[PDB]
């Protein structure tokens, strides 16, 4: 509810994308990986920034 | 839907759309209420009446089964059937429907309107699976009775102590009891949300109110007053459970070393502790919460919830466990609109404490080990089964007394009940008695005393004190007036105030009346301090005066002598115009 | 015990404190406050006696601008209060508060103790701009000083607040504009936590500090969460002078609104703002309930056209001022090109647009010839540029 | 871009205005205004190009925070269409009070619900946009 709150409030009319709810809410991500380049370009080591 | 007949408890879908709950019927069980009273009409899982495009017909009887729909005999397909035949009406489980003959009082319980006494002399005496529907029907006329009603609205911010009201013109203002809760409204720009519960009380000079309070929000000149709508909403648990007993303390084990101030008392808490539910009666002055703290600490590690159905009571309990029970492991439960002035200061609103402190107005559906009911003569039927359903516990306590405040149920005008008819509790304390008493007067005189356990109790009071005597009663003549909806006899208390310099004792004298008009009335002529006798039941005072304006029903019932002179500590002042008050406490002459 | 007592003020905050008031007892201060009950009312200065303060004082010993006020009232409005602070405690902008009962002769009276506010509020920077008299005028050179928009020298001058012998008054008053401005951001923020907590309030100015905290929850009714409404109707309004003697939107023309940052690098070309003032008007004034119409043309009678010339007149200080004037269109008469004013984009009323204009006219009659004469675009077209420096005024042409 | 910024409705004029200025027909970026469905065909052929310069996270349904009994839903009150514009429901409920089957029905028909209390994806199997798990 904080994050929440807080895009919510920074809206104009109150509405905001669907889209960016869990692009800026969501607390836990999940990537799914199909082959070792991919996981090597997007979450190389233990912290990597999406 | 589908579910249970009321009287018999067989399956069945069938409605009686013109009863005010519309309970369950089985087939054969609403057949014999649809030929006997005026009740035509009945709700299957689709309304039994006339499916013609314009038509009103309603009545079974004469009501028929055409194909897919419902039709009379004007427009109804040549084929056949009337829904009422055979002994039977049409619906759901034709099978097993058993038949009854408990029709004659059910009907009696449906189509009263509640008026007279009789109604409530034979809602009591039914199979009590029954009991619960004519509860149910009973609050729900007083609530249709209720809504037919006006508002209030205060007039501004007149004083912390004293509050002015006014009210839109037409229809009647009430009676001012504390048992008349009226909900406050904030009509602010531009929603109406609740914020206070007051209720009021009878003024001193023409307009004025002693109120109650709720909450800490100051009230603006947008506030109007709403007496209550809260509905009645369906229950299914018994008013009591049956009396089973155990050969040990089941469910709870003791502690050591517990206390000697209520010394007088461990082995009442261990026949507590054998069977399933008890009863206490409290006569007044007998501490019966701090009995209830003394057996919450015996067993300091199970389940004690406390419940009362009214606030002032919780309020009590409240201030008892500061002055007793520790503190952190309590909990007070506050309901969704906090409907008084909550007392919050402990653990409040925890469901997973031990030591629960809550009003049946809003119990959660919570376990408990053993429960402690209170002020029963308070509890109704209705609440009884929600304290049930919702709390469930091994051990029962219930205490209460009958002799004091009962269930106020306004709608009874004529005929005063009989105690036990007060709810079923009641019942149970007088016909086989209370399972206990605490036997102890620690406010009354020895004669005063004795006389109040002699015509009512067992003498089971006693006085911690020798007899103070300035307890007089007076042969007052009392020439009545009555220029109000109430009675009024000024001249007795000229009499009264006539007398009052022989006694420089009590001038810090508390008047006590059961007639309004004259309690309105006292402190005008005279400077003395006015009280009618709904202000009892919690306060005590050394000197009372008492002005009995007539000689009449509501004069002469005895619990109400009981709950307003037992008030005075060492003196009272006791004026009455009836020759039969008189050798039922022998006071002096003069 | 006096030091008891401080040093219970002293809570988990590690600060030192300098009693303002002399043996724990209350000290008497003269604010300013708005108060609206049934026996008083009005913007007016009172005399209040129920905070006990202590002043803060950082390393070296010096007096700083944060105070401990601990003011004391009776039991349940210490409840209510507790209550409401704790559905109001996530907000940021609301005061630090602290709730303890403590011990005076033999009995507990419960104190709640807001942390770290200014010496002032709102209401006495409000007042004091509002009701100024230059014989008595002392919360006002504070304010001032205390915030470093002066020296405390500027008042020897011959004369610091006239208008007419000293404009560098209005660089004075300019230092607090970001001190106001993060304040009504902060009533926004408060605003939003009240709705979203479903508490029903009115704001005072005399509630919320000079850094924009908020401390007083006496009459905060709780109603469903999220259905509570703030009442900004006494707020903004007397606020509403100071906005722009104090020039509180001048951060609005820096791009990412910051102080430091250059200036926005707007357009000659745009003349229509209503995008931009919709947007001010809900980043600031976003719960005044009352419609706001950035174009004058829409609004529903006269009382309308004041409500949004007002907002547009501040609206209208974070713009260019060379997107103001007449809006000029390239008309084609009998073949040749006119350059004729087709409207006005007002700093008060808005754009607005003329109902009648005739891009391919034939015949200019009298009146066309007169209209076409009078306007200024003909002359300021084909004129040259200019460039006063006589003159602050802009200037247009030559 | 940012995030929150769902109405390109002054974007898309100005796209048309300096690509297609002399096309004489008369264009709405939102279609709820079109004539009939022979505009509404026209705005969303110029729509479905003027779409294609506008971050895909944009688009979508929009959300919005309302109140049941006192309890915060979020809940779709709109959609930003590639080719219809934005539109917006004439039906909000901002503070309801009982919730009919009805209202049951489109409150768990619609993604609002799911995506905002999932966690967020991202697939890398696909170039196609995730939203949520
Ligand atoms: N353990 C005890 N020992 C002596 N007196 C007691 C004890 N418990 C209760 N009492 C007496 O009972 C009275 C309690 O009255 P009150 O507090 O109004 O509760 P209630 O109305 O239930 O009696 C007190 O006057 C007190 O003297
Ligand atoms: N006579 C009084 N004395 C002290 N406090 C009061 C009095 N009347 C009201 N209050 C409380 O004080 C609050 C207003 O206090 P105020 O003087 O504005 O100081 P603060 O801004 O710190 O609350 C009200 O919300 C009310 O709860
Ligand atoms: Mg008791
Ligand atoms: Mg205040
Ligand atoms: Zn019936
Ligand atoms: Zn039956
Ligand atoms: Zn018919
Ligand atoms: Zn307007
Ligand atoms: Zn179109």
């Known amino acids: 509810n904080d994050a929440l709150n807080n895009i919510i409030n920074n809206a104009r009319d109150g509405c905001v994308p669907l889209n960016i709810i869990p692009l800026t809410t969501a607390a836990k991500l999940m990537v799914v990986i199909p082959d070792y380049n991919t996981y090597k370009n997007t979450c190389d080591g233990t912290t990597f920034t999406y | 839907a589908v579910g249970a007949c009321v009287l018999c408890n067989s399956q069945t879908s069938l409605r009686c759309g013109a009863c005010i709950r519309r309970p369950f019927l089985c087939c054969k069980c609403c057949y014999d209420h649809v030929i006997s009273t005026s009740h035509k009409l009945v709700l299957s899982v689709n309304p039994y009446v006339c499916n013609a495009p314009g038509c009103d017909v309603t009545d079974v009887t004469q009501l028929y089964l055409g194909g897919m729909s419902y039709y009379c005999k004007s427009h109804k397909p040549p084929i056949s059937f009337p829904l009422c035949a055979n002994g039977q009406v049409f619906g759901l489980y034709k099978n097993t429907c058993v038949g009854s003959d408990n029709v004659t009082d059910f009907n009696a319980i449906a189509t009263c309107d509640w008026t007279n006494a009789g109604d409530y002399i034979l809602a009591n005496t039914c199979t009590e699976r029954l009991k619960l529907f004519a509860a149910e029907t009973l609050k729900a006329t007083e609530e249709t009775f209720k809504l037919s009603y006006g508002i209030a609205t205060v007039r501004e911010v007149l004083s912390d102590r004293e509050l002015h009201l006014s009210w839109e013109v037409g229809k009647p203002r009430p009676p001012l009891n504390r048992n008349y809760v009226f909900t406050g409204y904030r009509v602010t720009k531009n929603s109406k949300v609740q914020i206070g519960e007051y209720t009021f009380e009878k003024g001193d000079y023409g307009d004025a109110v002693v109120y109650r309070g709720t909450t800490t929000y100051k009230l603006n000149v947008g506030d109007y007053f709403v007496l209550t709508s809260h509905t009645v909403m369906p229950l299914s648990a018994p008013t009591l459970v049956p009396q089973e007993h155990y050969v040990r303390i089941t469910g709870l084990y003791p502690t050591l070393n517990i206390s000697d101030e209520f010394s007088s008392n461990v082995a009442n808490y261990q026949k507590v502790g054998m069977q399933k539910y008890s009863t206490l009666q409290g006569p007044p002055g007998t501490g019966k919460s701090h009995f209830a703290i003394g057996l919450a600490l015996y067993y300091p590690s199970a389940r004690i919830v406390y419940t009362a159905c009214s606030h002032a ?17 309590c909990s007070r439960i506050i309901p969704a609109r906090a409907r008084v002035e909550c007392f919050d200061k402990f653990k409040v609103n925890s469901t997973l404490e031990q030591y629960v402190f809550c009003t049946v107005n809003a119990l959660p559906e919570t376990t408990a080990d053993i429960v402690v009911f209170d002020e029963i003569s308070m509890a109704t039927n209705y609440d009884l089964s929600v304290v049930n359903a919702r709390l469930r516990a091994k051990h029962y306590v219930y205490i209460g007394d009958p002799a004091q405040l009962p269930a106020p149920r306004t709608l009874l005008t004529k005929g005063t009940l009989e105690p036990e008819y007060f709810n079923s509790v009641c019942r149970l304390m007088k016909t086989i008695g209370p399972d206990m008493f605490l036997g102890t007067c620690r406010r009354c005189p020895a004669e005063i005393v004795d006389t109040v356990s002699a015509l009512v109790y067992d003498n089971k009071l006693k006085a911690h004190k020798d007899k103070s ?24 208390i000229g009499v009264v105030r006539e007398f009052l310099t022989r006694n420089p004792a009590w001038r810090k004298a508390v008047f006590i009346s059961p007639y309004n008009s004259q309690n309105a009335v006292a402190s005008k002529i005279l400077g ?51 020759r039969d008050l008189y050798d039922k406490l022998q006071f002096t002459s003069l | 015990d006096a030091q008891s007592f401080l040093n219970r003020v002293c809570g988990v905050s590690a600060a030192r404190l300098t009693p303002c008031g002399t043996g724990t007892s209350t000290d008497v201060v003269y604010r300013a406050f708005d108060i609206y009950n049934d026996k008083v009312a009005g913007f007016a200065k009172f005399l209040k006696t129920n905070c006990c303060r202590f002043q803060e004082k950082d390393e070296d010993d010096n007096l700083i601008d ?3 006020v601990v003011k004391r009232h009776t039991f349940s409005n210490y409840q209510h209060e507790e209550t409401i602070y704790n559905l109001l405690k996530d907000c940021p902008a609301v005061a630090k508060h602290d709730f303890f009962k403590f011990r005076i002769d033999g009995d507990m009276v419960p104190h709640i103790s807001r942390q770290r506010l200014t010496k002032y509020t709102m209401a006495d920077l409000v007042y004091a701009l509002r009701h100024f008299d230059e014989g008595n005028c002392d919360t006002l050179k504070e304010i001032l000083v205390t915030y470093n928009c002066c020296d405390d020298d500027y008042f020897n001058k011959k004369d610091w607040y006239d208008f007419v012998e000293n404009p560098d008054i209005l660089r004075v008053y300019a230092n607090l ?25 009115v704001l005072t100015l005399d509630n919320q500090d000079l850094n924009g905290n908020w401390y007083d929850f006496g009459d905060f009714i709780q109603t469903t969460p999220g259905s509570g409404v703030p009442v900004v109707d006494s707020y903004y309004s007397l606020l509403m002078p100071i906005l722009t003697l104090t020039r509180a939107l001048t951060a609005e023309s820096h791009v990412d609104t910051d102080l430091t940052k250059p200036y926005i690098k707007w357009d000659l070309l745009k003349y229509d703002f209503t995008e931009e003032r919709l947007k001010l008007f809900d980043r600031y004034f ?57 409207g006005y984009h007002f700093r008060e009323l808005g754009v607005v647009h003329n109902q009648d204009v005739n891009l391919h006219s034939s015949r200019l009659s ?27 005024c802009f200037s247009v042409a030559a």
């Open chain 2, 313 to 329: 009571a919780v309020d009590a309990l409240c201030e008892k466990a500061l002055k007793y029970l520790p503190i952190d492991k």
């Open chain 3, 286 to 342: 976003k719960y005044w309930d009352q419609t706001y119409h950035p174009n004058c043309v829409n609004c529903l009678d006269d009382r309308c056209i004041l409500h949004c010339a007002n907002f547009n007149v501040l609206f209208s200080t974070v713009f260019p001022p060379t997107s103001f004037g007449p809006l000029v269109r390239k008309i084609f008469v009998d073949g040749v090109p006119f350059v004729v004013s087709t």
């Open chain 2, 528 to 578: 003395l301090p006015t009280q009618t006798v709904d202000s009892s039941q919690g306060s005590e005072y050394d000197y009372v005066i008492f002005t009995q304006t007539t000689e009449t029903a509501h004069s002469c019932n005895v619990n109400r002598f009981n709950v307003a002179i037992t008030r005075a500590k060492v003196g009272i002042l006791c004026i009455m115009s009836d």
């Open chain 3, 66 to 68: 944060s105070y401990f």
């Open chain 3, 177 to 201: 504009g970001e001190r106001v401005r993060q304040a009504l951001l902060k009533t926004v923020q408060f605003c939003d936590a009240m709705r979203n907590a479903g508490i029903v309030g």
């Open chain 2, 469 to 492: 005597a300035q307890c007089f009663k007076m042969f007052y003549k009392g020439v009545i007036t009555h220029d109000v909806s109430s009675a009024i006899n000024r001249p007795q």
């Open chain 3, 366 to 392: 009298f009146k066309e010839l007169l209209v076409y004469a009078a306007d200024p675009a003909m002359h300021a077209a084909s004129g040259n540029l200019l460039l006063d420096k006589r003159t602050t």
